[PDB]
Amino acid sequence: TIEERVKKIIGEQLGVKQEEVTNNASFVEDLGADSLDTVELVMALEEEFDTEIPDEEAEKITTVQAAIDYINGH
Amino acid sequence: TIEERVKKIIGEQLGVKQEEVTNNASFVEDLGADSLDTVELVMALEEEFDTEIPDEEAEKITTVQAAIDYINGH
Amino acid sequence: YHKKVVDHYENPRNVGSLDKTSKNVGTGLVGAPACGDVMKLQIQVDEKGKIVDARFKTFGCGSAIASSSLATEWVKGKTVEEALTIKNTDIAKELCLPPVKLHCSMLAEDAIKAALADYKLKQE
Amino acid sequence: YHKKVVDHYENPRNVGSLDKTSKNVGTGLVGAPACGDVMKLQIQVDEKGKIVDARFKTFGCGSAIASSSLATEWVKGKTVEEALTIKNTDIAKELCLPPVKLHCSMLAEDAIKAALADYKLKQE
Amino acid sequence: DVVNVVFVDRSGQRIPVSGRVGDNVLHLAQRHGVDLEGACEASLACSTCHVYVSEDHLDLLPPPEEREDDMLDMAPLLQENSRLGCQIVLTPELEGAEFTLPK
Amino acid sequence: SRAQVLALYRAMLRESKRFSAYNYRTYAVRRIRDAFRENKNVKDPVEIQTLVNKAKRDLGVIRRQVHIGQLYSTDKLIIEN
Amino acid sequence: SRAQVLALYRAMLRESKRFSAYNYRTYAVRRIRDAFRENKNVKDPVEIQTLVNKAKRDLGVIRRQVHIGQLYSTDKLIIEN
Amino acid sequence: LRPLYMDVQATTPLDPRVLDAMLPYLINYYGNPHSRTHAYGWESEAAMERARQQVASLIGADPREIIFTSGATESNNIAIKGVARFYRSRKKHLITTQTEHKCVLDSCRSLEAEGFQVTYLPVQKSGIIDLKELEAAIQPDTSLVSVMTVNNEIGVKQPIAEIGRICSSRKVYFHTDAAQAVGKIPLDVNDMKIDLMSISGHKIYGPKGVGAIYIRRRPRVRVEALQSGGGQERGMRSGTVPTPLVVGLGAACEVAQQEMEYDHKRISKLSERLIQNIMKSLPDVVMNGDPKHHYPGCINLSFAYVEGESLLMALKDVALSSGSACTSASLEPSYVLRAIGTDEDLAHSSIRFGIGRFTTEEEVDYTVEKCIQHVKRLREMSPLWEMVQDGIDLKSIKWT
Amino acid sequence: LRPLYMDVQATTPLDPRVLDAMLPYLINYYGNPHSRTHAYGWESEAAMERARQQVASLIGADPREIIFTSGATESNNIAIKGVARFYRSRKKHLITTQTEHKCVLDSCRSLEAEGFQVTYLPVQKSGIIDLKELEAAIQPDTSLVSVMTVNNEIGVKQPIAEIGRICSSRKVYFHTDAAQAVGKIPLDVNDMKIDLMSISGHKIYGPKGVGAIYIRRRPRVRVEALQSGGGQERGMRSGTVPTPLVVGLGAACEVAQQEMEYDHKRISKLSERLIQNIMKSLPDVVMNGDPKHHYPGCINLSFAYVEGESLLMALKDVALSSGSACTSASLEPSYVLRAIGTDEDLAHSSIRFGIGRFTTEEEVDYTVEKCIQHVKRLREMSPLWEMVQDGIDLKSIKWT
Ligand SMILES: *P(=O)(O)OCC(C)(C)[C@@H](O)C(=O)NCCC(=O)NCCSC(=O)CCCCCCCCCCC
Ligand SMILES: *P(=O)(O)OCC(C)(C)[C@@H](O)C(=O)NCCC(=O)NCCSC(=O)CCCCCCCCCCC
Ligand code: FES
Ligand SMILES: [Fe+2]
Ligand SMILES: [Fe+2]
């Protein structure tokens, strides 16, 4: 399941205990993560799902929902 | 001039004194050159004229006429 | 490390002990901890003159452990007289022990002889 | 090698010779103490007590060639008395010679002094 | 056929020993009470028969064998006059030779 | 200069993950993460430029060493299984 | 043989002409040419196969060293101008 | 699959930043640095001087005090033998400790054969020398004192600064073998009053076959050269200077100066993790050496009733070292462990663990797990363990 | 643009095949070859044994007779000092030549200070020693004879096999410095009856900082160790063996063995080209050393009435060497050229050209053209040339 895998990746990267991660939680505001955390989260998504995410779409990925939508679409 | 440059390259590579090279002299039968000589002549042509000669056309290049035709076409 | 020695450690055969009170059990205990090699070779004799069970416990290097294991394996199935025939040269030849490791074969032989002597003395 | 030494060799200044038969020319020819360095320094004097020309030829190292060239350049335009004030420390300061290279400067000073002595002896 | 040698125990005391040709130095010492070990019993594996040979008589000995030299280079306190006692054989050329036991 | 730092950080991480040797790979990822976390609050623009130049030299070294370690590579570690 | 040898010869020459260093480039080109001239009249198939294997191993060495010399390049010689 | 490397005290991997600095001189700048008439020599010479300044900067010295060698073995030989032979006419006495490296100990024995008197200081059970014995061992005839900074076998640290103060008060040259300390703990030759110091390249993630010795110039210390030749390295070490090697050594020193604090805190964390996790799981495990004067990167443990070589052979997926006579070609028991008063039984049981610049928590955890399981298996095979668990004292038992 | 390299006697560029063999041990196989308990050490030890076999194969020896060193300086010190000290009780006399390398000459001078007697054999004007003088110089208390194979200054070859026969007949150990000969001219230690040989890695397109010494085992040559330590290399050289360096030395020896005949033919032709083209265009040019017993790769020419370092300064685009005292740090004249009876004036005019494995015909022609032009420019500048061309003899002229 793409949903559970994406949520697991985000939880393992940002230490959200798998409970705080929701479909409307932002990477920076809701969860505790700076711009050095989100670069690595995006790269971990690229590692798990083989996809060279362009810089524009990477900076568009700011929320769990955005990452979910990108991974499901691609 | 393409003609003169090709003739000069062939003469320098095979030591034909710039006089023996004609438009119907073959590399092996007419001039004194083996296959080791040819791989070096074709590479010199590829160095002077920037062109990645395929193997199929390189094995077709057996005479001065063939080399001139290939260089002029490409 | 040599393949035979590594196999002797990685696959144990007869690691254990036996009852010292039983009249049909001999016990060998040779080497000193200060020296760094200690072996406990134990044999069992049935009603007739045949060895039926053997156990060992060895404190020492891989070569000492292999030497004790091979000594126990070769001891089981023989009689007292045939067990006395085992020399350190055979153990060293089988394990391909380099000259620095010749103590392991000598001390395994000494453990064999000590166990046999204990059996005879206590059977008297 | 240093900038000035390189320039003094690569760009000749007064390499040549002067007629020894001429009465108005003094010639020096001196050598190094502990190496193969030879300098020929020749100065010329006009009717009045002024040096109008000076030429050198040197068999030696690059620093020696540079020292001779600088000595000729500094001698030109001076009088005998003003030239006697030239010392090896000044040449060394201008060429930035390392400690192993002061033999060239001392040779250049000796050549200057020898040529001036030759001028006085011949003009007597 | 009698050859007289001198043994020098570690103390430095000189022990004159009389022997005959065809004997072994290590054993001649053992019979005459010299503290030379012969631990490997002349099988060329111990270096305990180590001895220093006198300067004059050294070249009169036969050149050592390959295993004799292999044992010597491990033998402690090696010198240019070192041989192994279990390989020297008494010969008429060895009269007056002095064997010194290394410390 | 936020964009240049986020881009150089990403380049340096994606570079270090291509090290063939386990020790070098784990080291370069850990060090870069720790070094950029160490300098998150540095205010002086001169110091920030000096750090960005050292990071560029560091990235050049990582590129050359990753390539060379690809040219001469060996078996993976027992922990990597 | 005629085709594989001629293919290996062309590959070796192509790779050697990419050496950054003048000494290595010139030596490699000359050595390859001389060796192939020396072994042109060999008749033993086993000897020919052994020579091909040796040349393949040298091709590998040439590829790796050309790359590392491109990673670490210097100025050209006074004679190349 | 290759085993994990946990043996940094034996040698270190090359730092990629060191290899990167080295490669240009292995490809293009191949000139001889003592060629003084052309550009290959000039650029090689410049690189050599740059590396010399890097080493001096790491240890707080002037560059003119750094002499490149082929390793810390040669550095120790130069220090001890050269100082002793230069000052032979007045000073015939040397002082060192019983726990020194063997290059130092063997140089001292060769001098003792050449006519010198040598005192070998004992150490306490902590592995640290006692300064009163050091003070009482000094003669008007004393030339040199040689005490190492970090022990290569158990990781204890000697009071180097105090030793140097005492030596300067008594007017005796002080040498320290720092081959296990350079780039790992802070060092300052002027604050510790050090006269000679040995440095090794491949103990600090630099290349093998290169070293350095620091020789003080104010006040001037002189040595008698051991290697004769053309007077290179100020006349103290003749031969061609290996430019790629000294360039690598300088690069490693610069990297160490930049990375020391970060490395030390990480290595301390990892060493605490290792020791706690092993002690928390196995009874009768003992650390050798004093924890209060101890470098975290070198951990030496004894596993009672299990032989060190047997445990090492069991741990076929982790690279380590022992202190067993059995692990030696000469069947030599560990003299360091003998000197710190270890029971001969527990000396055959010691294992050395190394944590360095590239160790990960993953490897530390794997090593601890494998060690726990194999120590349990070997104890279940040990007769000594059987007797100990069965209410028997080892000392009272007769052994043959 | 960088200058051309014609200074191969000083050092060589690294062979790319050698670097290709070396790099795996600089990246992945970094273990200590003396580590006996794990796979890093096992693979390092195996690589070291392979290299030892390669060197022994090049020189025709048993691999057990090869000892790795840090260079030919260390090899020469081990040979000379070790033999002299080991056989001290009976043999107190040494023999070498006046044209030997300074590592050898300085070892002999230090032994003279140590209480030994040293004879320095003169050479004939060809640079070759007289065998009759050698036979006359041997005493009943002679320990060692040391003659180099190829001279690094003028490239003349000594009659090594004849010298070895004489030494074996007189029962005297024979050492040869072969640093300039290994991999370039044929060597067989058994055919030449050599007892000790020095080898240098960076003279044979191998890495710097490594070497080897050959010590015969049948009959057994023994040496007294100079570097004390842990007993590595059979106890003859203590310290950690630098695995990447010894692997590179082995690779260089294997490549030299494969390449030697082709290299020698090519180098002889290029040397002939250089010499003939310089001689056909310049008068009063002389070759130092006999052509009949000459290694073609080392060419030594004196350009009369031109100073060597000024010529070198003119040839700024070609890296060369000179025997001029003005190129020395200590203002030291060329003792080799003094020994072969060269006038000092012509000894200050000496230029050494080095032709090696990677030299090219274009480089040779460029060098010849530049040398002709600059010698003509400096002769036009020289007072010696002026007096000679003006009908004057240099000897008769007074000099101050
Ligand atoms: P985000 O939450 O917006 O924050 C991102 C940054 C850090 C850019 C932001 O916090 C910021 O603007 N901070 C101000 C100062 C700043 O950006 N500092 C960082 C400077 S760059 C830096 O620290 C480089 C570190 C160098 C890496 C060396 C490691 C290489 C190892 C080599 C061995 C193989
Ligand atoms: P053409 O007229 O068709 O002839 C070409 C060939 C050679 C194919 C032909 O003459 C032929 O068939 N001859 C029979 C033998 C033969 O094919 N010889 C080639 C054998 S392969 C060989 O000799 C390779 C040599 C190895 C090159 C090593 C170069 C080293 C470089 C190291 C640089 C660092
Ligand atoms: S007696 Fe054992 S070696 Fe001679
Ligand atoms: Fe000069
Ligand atoms: Fe044992």
Numbering used by the authors:
A (entry chain C), B (entry chain G): 3 to 76
C (entry chain D), D (entry chain H): 35 to 158
E (entry chain I): 69 to 171
F (entry chain B), G (entry chain F): 5 to 85
H (entry chain A), I (entry chain E): 56 to 455
Give sentences from the paper.
This complex is composed of the iron-sulfur scaffold protein ISCU2, the dimeric pyridoxal phosphate (PLP)-dependent cysteine desulfurase subcomplex NFS1-ISD11-ACP1, the allosteric regulator frataxin (FXN), and the electron donor ferredoxin-2 (FDX2), which is itself reduced by the NADPH-dependent ferredoxin reductase (FDXR). FDX2 and FXN compete for binding to overlapping sites at the core ISC complex during de novo [2Fe-2S] cluster biosynthesis.
First, to elucidate the interaction site of reduced FDX2 with the (NIAU)2 complex, the (NIA)2 subcomplex was incubated for 20 min with iron-loaded ISCU2 and FDXR-reduced FDX2 to yield the (NIAUF)2 sample. In the (NIAUF)2 dataset, 61% of the particles belong to a class in which FDX2 is bound in the proximal conformation, and 39% belong to a distal-bound FDX2 class. This revealed two major FDX2 conformations that we refer to as ‘proximal’ and ‘distal’ according to the distances between the [2Fe-2S] cluster of FDX2 and the FeS cluster assembly site of ISCU2, namely 23 Å for the distal conformation and 14 Å for the proximal conformation. In the distal conformation, fewer salt bridges are formed with NFS1’ than in the proximal conformation and the overall resolution of FDX2 is lower than for the rest of the complex, indicating a more flexible binding mode in the distal position than in the proximal conformation, where FDX2 appears well resolved.
